[PDB]
């Protein structure tokens, strides 16, 4: 009803601010590394946790607003298909795309696409999809979501038959 929308948009705008504040920090050379992690590694870690908990709480916000007569919420309650994640990507926020367990890599020199400037580690740049399927993806989010897309397809294709072989 958003209400919920306003709140979700604001929840994400919040995480873009924690991610911005950690960028400024780490660019001043104030971020401390942990033990046995790089700066860059521990930078990425913070950014991925902010982004994840933003997605998470944006999906939660949507699920509470769904009302008893809501058909998806009824399938869910009955247990017949599908899950929190499903509702959340559809209504709240697709969230972070990822190849090889990291955010979208700089496949172009220091950028993920030529629409960005170089050395841009913002969520937008590295494949946080902000929009739900409902609102539809921007072209950048579209591509990064295909990137994440393919990674899953390839892994499905590697068992079929890597498993029909284990079972034998």
């Amino acid at each position: 009803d958003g209400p919920t929308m306003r709140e979700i948009t604001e929840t994400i705008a919040e995480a873009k601010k924690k991610v911005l504040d950690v960028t400024k920090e780490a660019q001043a050379n104030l971020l401390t590394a942990k033990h046995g992690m790089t700066l860059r590694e521990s930078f990425e870690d913070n950014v991925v946790r902010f982004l994840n908990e933003a997605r998470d709480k944006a999906g939660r916000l949507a699920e509470v607003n769904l009302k008893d007569l809501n058909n998806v919420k009824q399938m869910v309650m009955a247990g017949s298909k599908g899950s929190f994640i499903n509702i959340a990507q559809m209504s709240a926020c697709v969230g972070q795309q990822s190849v090889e367990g990291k955010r979208i890599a700089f496949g172009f020199v220091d950028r993920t696409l030529p629409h960005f400037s170089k050395d841009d580690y913002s969520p937008e740049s590295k494949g946080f999809v902000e929009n739900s399927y409902l609102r539809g993806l921007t072209p950048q989010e579209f591509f990064f979501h295909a990137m994440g897309g393919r990674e899953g397809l390839i892994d499905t294709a590697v068992k079929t038959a890597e498993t029909g072989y284990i079972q034998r």
Binding site: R55, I85, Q96, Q97, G148, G152
Partner: peptide
């Protein structure tokens, strides 16, 4: 396609 340590 969801977030790191979930789906691609």
């Amino acid at each position: 396609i969801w977030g790191i340590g979930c789906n691609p």
